[PDB]
Assembly symmetry: C5
């Protein structure tokens, strides 16, 4: 993930211009190799046409170039690219939205599962670790970085995500499918055991816990679904064929013919086709957007930081369920204890952001006196 | 379903180009027959125009040619294709999202329905089997592969999904409609019986179970709705008419008129119309995306693996409700029992994925001492 | 509703081509009259121009035709058609999604409302009949077919949906609004009475019942919303003007001018304008999609089968809440009672659909021995 | 709100044609003034060029018109109009969907809040009046018609929406913000008081009531948000500049040059530019769609009937919570008391709508005996 | 935020025209610097070409201008601008929808947390202050204005949002991540303590409180997500490259060549390129829409008033949970106590908005006498 929110906070002079100086996760870094190959092919064809052929062959090549230039269509490639990239971006944001965050569940666990003793600590930590284990299982199934971090369940055990007992239980329960669903059944059974043992005081609290755990399960299932059901290969191949056919016919139809022949559009020999290269940058970058976002769990610069998410989730959830359980700051009257209308101060740098309240669009409507009497 | 997520994990050199060497679910496999028919018709017309005409019918054909090519438009076909295919893809993903997964229900059943004895085993298995039976009923109603697997309720009984008693009950209840809704009423009545018999300890747990079952029912109803209410036949016919009219007028417009006659644009003879063939591939593949995704429950290469989903759901749900009920790994302190800030290790292949936490876009904003002072 | 899902299950040769032979809900049936009018007007103009005027008037008409030829724009009409039809299709699917289905409510009623005696039967049937009565009230308010079936509350009483007592209660409660909301108040009060009388054991069950009834009420309110708040008449008139201004200027600008005058685009006299007729079919069918779908509760071929939905809902709900209450098939161990991994069989026609499980996109990643070692 | 759903129920001959004869909420009524101004300016320019200008000035004006007619493009204005109008329509439908309907809350109040005496009547009426008061407060904040009806809280008190005691309490609570949120806190406190006093029998019923009231609060907050956060002024100005630049360029570029000079585009003088006028109608009406829908709470013909909604909500909610509380029609066996398959009759006008049930797309698949045999 | 809802309430004469006179948040203020730079560069090139070079160099520049003005395509830039700006607007409205509002939670707290004494006041205020503190933490993490107001946790303490005890607890809990999640765990633990101490009477009320808190947590997490996972830099760079390449090739291709050479489109020298400047305004303003909305928490005119939101939330929540707890207006019969059909009056200015109720689109369907008979 490349973040430039601070840079694009305000719509200043050249705000998007200053983003063109970035390298990581950029268009140049994405398509420099393709541009180099295109350059090599274009100039090889140019040299072949210029100083490798006879007069009749050059005339035939010029006829072919004139035939090719008219066959360069921008409406269809733009149309397919726009919708394909829109679909890819929508799926990418949905995939991020299905990343499981254990925050609600950990707050509920810390509140509900009672006991400041070792048994209560074990119960809370085991529940939140079941949640984290399910999350890391689906993440290592769907993300190459997480898989490289934990290439096996033995690696998961050595990293502390799984106990050896849990690993043995998983091996005993092994079926010819992905076993990421097992920790949710473990969580449900452990929560029922906690309620029966008196650690969870009410079945409504049990239901809230299981609802949050079910939401996490649904998010993980959506992640698995997005990993499994790819965008249709026919659609991807169609958009690729459009782009590459465009920039393969351009290789011939954008060649600088001899200016002596006084062609309508080939009166000048600029050597470099700057507009063809600009179109290459634009269209191939538009395609590279979809190329990068089609699997947002790879190792691209703009892919998600799944390893950081895993580490943060583990640390935060463990802290919340263990140290923060029934550990509150002292409850004391606040600064505005007897102030009916509190007014927090503004700094000198933020005094200009103090605004009057918006009371509605109809507030300033002016009505005459007679217009306001109720009619019988 | 054809998966290439691992192939497109990173935006590497020619990442989408390497996808053009596939055959399953590919554009070539989808439109090779149409391309062969187009080839045959095009070259039949070419041979008829040159070796089977006279010097006046030929001259007329040329007149028709330069008329047909001038009456070729791409914006309308691109528009109708883009919008229609976008609608088809949206409906395809919605249809996948409405595929019922019994994971939440099975976790709730395993947790809630108490009893490690034969009666408890039977109750849990029967509830989850009612869920699976409803899912398989709607799936065999809407999916050709599942129907070929289970062409009759007797086949369902022989497959173990339905008991002979359940089959007799369904036959007794037979209405002149699709009877896929019956297992949900069965589940509701059996869950009420379990609660009244003490197997379910609290009506809040009963409500949670029924909420999960009703979510499954809504998903199955949406699947039935998508099977029944097709995309408007008028819209499908409009897009088909656009594409086929384009590629029928191309048959005359894209003919290679003889070089001897004088015509702008037609000055040489390239035999093979490579640009017309590229356009055919692009547009007919764009249409084949919709042709394949319009019913994602057929037997195309990119259609859903409903049979595998059924088998996996049955196995996983039965295991979860029978063998995993109150069967937990031993609860022991984890690796980070007294570690305030756990830090799982990174492998050599993943050490580069260790990232600092993102604390917000405002973190690096610099303010002076006078700027930070609160104003009175 | 016209269904062709079975016909479009697989992407076969000419899959969308075989849909052009349909008559019901087809483009031909939708626009044959407008095509006939366009034909008649076009050939009236053609016959007037060639044999009705003098040479000067003919030359003036040729100049006007050339002027009109350059004012035939496809981009704007395509844009407005695409956006408007997309909106119409979205609203059409939303309207279908807001059609109330009593399945969840009927399962909850059958489970929760106890009593196999006459009073319990009456209570369950009355609750489900209140649901069905509200549904039929909103449906007869919004659908012409349902209104023609039940043109009056007396017709509803004769049909059995409403009792004479309920009819008199409605007449007593009569207000100058649509009274489709009354059955939900009746349902809430009757459910409260049932809970107070002991027929409903727990207020949590009461809450579940009322949540389902409120979901049905929201769906009915959305149906009323879509029936009341139409797509803006200005937008509909704009798209109609865009289509008709195109096909009114085509009448003059697509006339076959005399070939003797040797105009650029009028060398040939083909009599029948095939491209103009194809464009008429394409665009007028695109508009006919919106014309048919703008009110999906009319009597079009592709409109919803609301009468069938009403009949099916009544029958299914009554059966579920009366005959299926506490009436379950015999509970006995299944075929996989002691099978850890059930494997239901495949038929000969479905053996090709047996596939291995998808274990994740990262499953096949190959790592070296040194790469997999945890770093300190 | 202009309704034509009955007119567009079926896709008949000229179904959208017959909508062009409407005046209320129509394109003519929306843009007649703009069309008159554009007409006056166009003909002023034409007369000035024809008469006032000398020969050299006319020659310069002719060159200017020729240079202007090639700077009039439809693609960018079409894009900006389509996307902007789509966003405006989406926001308009969302704004209507956020209009609060008290139906679910009123059913819950009537059911849950017990007591047929004066105290129970007062409690139910006060709760539903708090809901209606919050709704009318946000509506008078966001809607010009509702503000004109109730220009002050004193007007609200005279209209009966607010009790003078409630007015005094609001004045005591007065804060420098919109106080539409106060009745929700009032409702919560009154519901808690009712539960503590025994009028509400169960805290789960209390929770259901508060959940419905909170849904209403969320809808009202969304209405306030839509009123406050307008569509970006930069975007609105961009679309306005596009349209107006188009039709200011057209003023000169569409002038009928003198036919004597014999430019190809201006060979004859039609006087009236019918195509420019049709384009004006199309584009300015497309913009008028967004102009009318940008604030759907104004006083346009297609704007919402917020006053009627307020009146209907008040009447219906008061009736439901006061006269309909525990007032049910007599519970008697229905027409299908012992009928397993109820078949309500059809009328002569609805006989053709009786259809067989759709049993699934796989129903008609034909399989051989050998194909249907299970394999080992 | 710039509001013009009252200005655009009605679709009057030139309603969008009158919005072109605004300055705050306007296209002029957004792109005047870019337009000045474009002006300077264009006229520098013009003055170079006019009198800086020799005749041969001027001829070469003229050929370059002719060959550059033929490579200006509005199609791709329009496509990418439309799609990218639509994505930006969608994300902007989602970011607004994820702004946390404590209204539902404060109503639930005021209702549920009992006690009119000092301890009850402290408990309610502390809970609502935990909610406000979490909101302000995420807002100061994501918003530059809020960060400038509160550049440190000590600033938060001095402002009254945090007590010294809470600051000391946060410092104890300090983790190398954003600590905005801590107040939710604090709220959960404090609510559980309140329920155990008898201040909250029922665990269902506890569950409702925690559900509202978790909804707020989800909103804050979505805000953090939008701050962190920005729009792909490759996509932003692609759209920027498209726009700037267009307006860089325009700098040369839109130059007024010598009229003496009688170029096809350079016959007249108007000095000022009005249409090029209009295109600059249109396209650069369309890009400035996305530039302003890409981070809606900056300090642009159309960016959100997060400081006002914070102040209003604090004041309103404190008032609701402290002063309005169990403080209700006197319950007395209303104006319509014995009126079955209340009819609130209309003012003179609003008497025209009294409309008859809409009874459904099928209301006016007229059927013959014999058409209404039920048939056997
Ligand atoms: Ca990637
Ligand atoms: Ca298919
Ligand atoms: Ca219809
Ligand atoms: Ca309006
Ligand atoms: Ca901004």
């Amino acid at each position: 993930t490349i973040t430039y929110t601070s840079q694009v906070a305000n719509a200043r002079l050249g705000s998007f211009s200053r983003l063109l100086l970035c390298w990581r996760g950029s268009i140049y870094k994405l398509l420099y190799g393709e541009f180099l190959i295109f350059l090599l092919c274009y100039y090889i064809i140019r040299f072949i046409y210029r100083l490798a052929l006879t007069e009749e062959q050059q005339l035939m090549f010029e006829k072919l170039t004139l035939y090719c230039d008219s066959y360069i269509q921008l409406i269809p490639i733009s149309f397919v690219l726009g919708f394909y990239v829109t679909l890819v971006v929508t799926r990418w944001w949905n995939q991020y939205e299905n990343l499981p965050w254990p925050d609600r569940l950990m707050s509920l666990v810390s509140g509900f599962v009672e006991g400041k003793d070792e048994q209560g600590r074990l119960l809370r930590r085991t529940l939140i670790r079941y949640a984290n284990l399910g999350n890391v299982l689906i993440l290592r199934s769907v993300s190459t970085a997480v898989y490289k971090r934990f290439p096996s369940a033995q690696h998961l055990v050595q990293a502390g995500f799984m106990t050896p007992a849990e690993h043995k239980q998983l091996e005993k329960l092994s079926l010819p499918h992905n076993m990421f669903w097992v920790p949710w059944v473990w969580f449900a059974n452990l929560s029922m055991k906690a309620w029966l043992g008196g650690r969870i005081r009410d079945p409504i609290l049990l239901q809230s816990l299981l609802n949050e755990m079910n939401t996490l399960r649904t998010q993980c299932g959506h992640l698995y679904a997005y990993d499994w059901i790819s965008i249709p290969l026919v659609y991807t191949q169609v958009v690729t064929v459009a782009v590459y056919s465009f920039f393969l016919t351009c290789l011939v139809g954008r060649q600088f013919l001899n200016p002596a022949k006084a062609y309508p559009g080939h009166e000048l020999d600029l050597v470099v086709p700057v507009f063809t290269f600009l179109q290459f940058f634009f269209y191939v970058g538009w395609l590279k957007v979809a190329e990068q976002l089609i699997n947002p769990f790879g190792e691209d610069d703009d892919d998600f930081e799944t390893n950081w998410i895993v580490d943060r989730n583990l640390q935060v959830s463990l802290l919340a369920v263990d140290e923060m359980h029934q550990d509150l700051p002292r409850m004391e009257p606040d600064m505005y204890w007897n102030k009916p209308e509190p007014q927090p101060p503004y700094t000198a740098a933020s005094a200009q952001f103090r605004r009057a309240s918006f009371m509605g669009s109809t507030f300033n409507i002016s009505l005459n006196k007679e217009e306001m009497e109720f009619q019988p």
